[PDB]
Design a protein around this ligand. Structure first.
Ligand code: ZN
Ligand code: ZN
Lengths: 62, 98, 115, 49, 304, 44, 64, 69
RNA sequence: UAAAUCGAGAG
């Protein structure tokens, strides 16, 4: 009910250790509902074209 | 680039080969496979769709020698054409009667 | 799928101060490229096809003497279903400040949809 | 055979064309919201005002 | 040694009926590969004509524009597909459509109340004018030289009683539809066949004689024109095996469970082709076999 | 006549700085009329 | 060059709750042309405890 | 809302058989099965197209913004 | 651009 202090910002879950150090939000990650697919090599993941257009990898030119 | 030869499967002899055809399904593939399996020189023939969502078909043809896989494919295509031609002729003849 | 959003031009004022913003265009130099989806009164035509980054309503702002457009904020293309002008329960004949604009989005069955 | 339902197509489409002018059909649909309607109606009418 | 000559000697067509919308014929001594290829090509690959694009000018009715355009695309048009060519997707939308590949239809219907309506009336025909919008209201507008080549057979929906929309006074619909050549494997509206399918010929093998009253019971387990009691001696025989579905009701009785076998003549197909209206089923089957032949020819003539 | 009253359905044209209300009745809700404009679609 | 994800790239697939380490694996990427779902082989469902009842999961793209 | 143009399962045009179906049920005292058979709907995929249609559009049509009431 | 609280859901 009162304004949280510095201690109240670190102590419990939703604090600063458990919510922004041990678990963080990340870049270059997608989330989606899965569907089954045979004709996939059982070590592969079938990605949509949208994810293939957004997600990128920095390849140094050689 | 309608039909392409897969160099990772073809043999230097030429008896064994794999062909990839764009925009095909189990419509041309099944008929062609059966018609070329009629060939006494062909040893192994099969067709496969890598993924259903891609309009790609593969035909594997391996012979007993004396005939390349390309020649077998040509004979199969010609025989399929002749089969369709005879069914067309029979249908046209039967239409005239009734 | 239908989504109705209310665009209110009276959210920057209270207590009956002079109405700063008026629906429509002014006499500044705004690109005609966004006149495709807006009428002469700065409101969208019914049935037009609106994507992300396209204007929905154009309002002139006296404080800046500039014609500013509110835009459509969604990645799902939508069609303008309807537009309603909401005059207020006030004795004074106040210029329109509230517009209720309803879009429709075609939800045809894609894979991954729960049946 | 006794497990017989029926599509009331002629009945249904006619009611679609012309809604009733006396009372709503399906009286059971009004008894579902009676615990709310008759509850609100009880704080202004009934015995003792 | 299989050969085209042997198949030509063994193949035979047995037409059972022929109509303007349905052909029920037979293909004997042909492999299920070729028959299934014909079936698939009929369903999915023989081109037809349907309204591909819709340009709306006003739709004040209770039906949304996308649904209305979908319905206008779903109505079959009685235009022979040979009379127009194929459009180019890579062509710009200005010059993509010509008078040789696109047919223009127009629909301009405005509803308005009928003041002379009978008193105490509920029928929406006596009450309103143009209350119901039908496919026959799709007027065809010939542009260019198609005003001459379509003069003998104007474009008109195959089923004109299709109910496109319903209107109320004040509401109106004005639109144009551009109809192009397309195949059923792209969208289901281009499939010319209402349904194309073959079935194997049923085969009822009476293993042991079923003479006597049981034959009447045996005759009862099939559609009437399938099992007949022999006129001379009380005994069952297969009068016609085309008239029974494979229902296996005889298998549900222990009396005949050991006295009959059900199978198929697995090279004898009964093809039942029901068309949509733009083409006759015989021409549909002809186009299917021609499409298979041309597909094989194109594959044969392409460098590897 | 760019607008329609939401009660008596009467068409009305509204100018700048004009009272947002129907003229034939005291209703303050107006719907924007669907004017004739080219809206392309695809019959799929 | 910040190139698009290809067929030779690897991806970290994880489905919550991550009770055991096998619920977060590495899959070789194959890109499909049609729809907006992550398509997964049936054998992977044993470790992820994943059905196809609208279940969702996360793909991570390592950048080195 | 309004009757579908085509049967979903096979594609047979059934949008021209809704007013006919209602008239067959209305004037002629017919059951649904015989009326469907007379319309030429043999397969049950086509039969449930017209047998189970609700025709909600009429209920939609009574709410008309463009006409006074 | 933010934060809580409440409510509704998915696996
Ligand atoms: Zn009014
Ligand atoms: Zn059907």
């Amino acid at each position: 009910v009162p304004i949280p202090g510095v201690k109240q910002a670190l102590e419990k879950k939703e604090g600063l250790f458990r919510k922004h150090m041990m678990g963080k939000r990340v870049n270059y990650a997608a989330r989606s509902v899965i569907s089954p697919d045979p004709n996939i090599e059982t070590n592969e993941i079938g990605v949509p074209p949208v994810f293939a257009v957004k997600l990128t990898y920095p390849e140094p030119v050689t | 680039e309608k039909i392409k030869l897969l160099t990772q499967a073809t043999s230097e002899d030429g008896t064994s080969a794999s062909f990839q055809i764009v925009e095909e399904d189990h419509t041309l593939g099944n008929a062609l496979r059966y018609v070329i399996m009629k060939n006494p020189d062909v040893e192994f023939c099969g067709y496969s769709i890598p993924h259903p969502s891609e309009n790609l078909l593969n035909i594997r043809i391996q012979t007993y020698g004396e005939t390349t896989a390309v020649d077998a494919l040509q004979k199969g295509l010609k025989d399929l054409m002749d089969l369709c031609d005879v069914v067309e002729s029979k249908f046209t003849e039967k239409i005239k009667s009734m | 799928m239908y989504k109705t959003e209310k665009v209110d031009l009276a959210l920057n004022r209270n207590r009956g101060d002079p109405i700063t913003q008026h629906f429509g265009f002014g006499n500044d130099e705004w690109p005609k490229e966004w006149l495709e989806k807006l009428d002469e009164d700065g409101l969208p035509y019914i049935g037009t096809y609106v994507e992300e980054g396209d204007p929905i309503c154009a309002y002139f702002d006296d404080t800046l003497n500039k014609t500013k457009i509110k835009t459509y904020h969604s990645s799902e293309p939508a069609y303008i279903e309807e537009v309603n002008l909401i005059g207020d329960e006030s004795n004074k004949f106040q210029e329109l400040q509230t517009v209720s604009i309803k879009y429709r989005i075609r939800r045809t069955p894609q894979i991954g949809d729960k049946f | 055979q006794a497990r017989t339902a029926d599509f009331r197509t002629l009945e249904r489409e006619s009611r679609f064309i012309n809604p009733p002018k006396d009372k709503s059909a399906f009286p059971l649909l009004q008894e579902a919201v009676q615990p709310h309607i008759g509850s609100f109606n009880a704080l202004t009418e009934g015995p003792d005002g | 040694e299989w050969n085209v000559e042997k198949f030509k000697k063994d193949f035979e067509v047995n037409i059972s009926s022929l109509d303007a919308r349905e052909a029920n014929f037979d293909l004997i001594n042909i492999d299920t590969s070729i028959a299934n290829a014909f079936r698939r090509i009929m369903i999915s690959e023989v081109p037809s004509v349907a309204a591909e694009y819709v340009y709306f000018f006003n739709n004040t009715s209770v039906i949304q524009d996308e649904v209305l355009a979908h319905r206008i695309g779903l109505v079959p048009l009685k235009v022979d597909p040979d009379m127009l060519t194929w459009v180019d997707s890579n062509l710009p939308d200005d010059e993509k459509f010509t008078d040789e590949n696109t047919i223009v239809l127009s629909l301009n219907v405005k509803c308005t109340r009928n003041p002379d309506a009978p008193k105490g009336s509920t029928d929406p025909k006596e009450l309103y004018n143009n209350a119901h919008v039908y496919a026959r209201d799709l007027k065809f507008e010939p542009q260019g030289r198609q005003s001459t080549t379509f003069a003998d057979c104007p474009v008109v929906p195959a089923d004109p009683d299709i109910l496109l929309a319903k209107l109320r006074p004040g509401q109106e619909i004005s639109l144009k539809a551009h109809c192009i050549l397309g195949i059923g494997g792209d969208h289901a509206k281009f499939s010319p066949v209402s349904t194309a399918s073959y079935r194997l010929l049923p085969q009822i093998n009476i293993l042991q004689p079923i003479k006597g009253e049981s034959a009447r019971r045996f005759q009862k387990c099939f559609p009437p024109g399938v099992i007949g009691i022999d006129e001379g001696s009380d005994e069952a025989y297969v009068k016609d095996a085309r008239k029974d579905t494979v229902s296996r009701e005889v298998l549900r009785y222990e009396e005949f469970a050991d006295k009959v076998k059900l199978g198929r003549v697995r090279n004898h197909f009964i093809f039942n082709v029901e068309s949509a209206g733009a083409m006759t089923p015989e021409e549909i089957f002809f186009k299917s076999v021609r499409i298979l032949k041309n597909k094989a020819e194109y594959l044969k003539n392409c460098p590897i | 006549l760019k607008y329609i009253c939401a009660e008596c359905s009467s068409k009305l044209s509204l100018s700048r700085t004009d009272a947002v209300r129907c003229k034939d009745c005291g209703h303050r809700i107006l719907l924007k009329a669907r004017t004739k404009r080219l809206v392309q679609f695809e019959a799929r | 060059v910040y190139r698009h994800i290809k067929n030779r790239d690897v991806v970290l697939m994880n489905r919550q709750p991550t009770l055991h380490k096998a619920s977060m694996m590495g899959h070789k990427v194959r890109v499909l042309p049609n729809e907006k779902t992550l398509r997964l082989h049936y054998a992977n469902t044993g470790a992820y405890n994943a059905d196809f009842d609208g279940d969702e999961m996360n793909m991570h793209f390592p950048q080195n | 809302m309004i009757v579908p143009v085509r049967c979903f399962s096979c594609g047979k045009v059934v949008g021209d058989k809704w007013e006919s179906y209602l008239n067959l049920l209305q004037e002629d005292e017919l059951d649904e099965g015989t009326a469907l058979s007379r319309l030429g709907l043999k397969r049950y995929c086509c039969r449930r197209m017209i047998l189970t249609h609700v025709d909600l559009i009429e209920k939609f049509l009574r709410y008309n913004p463009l006409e006074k009431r």
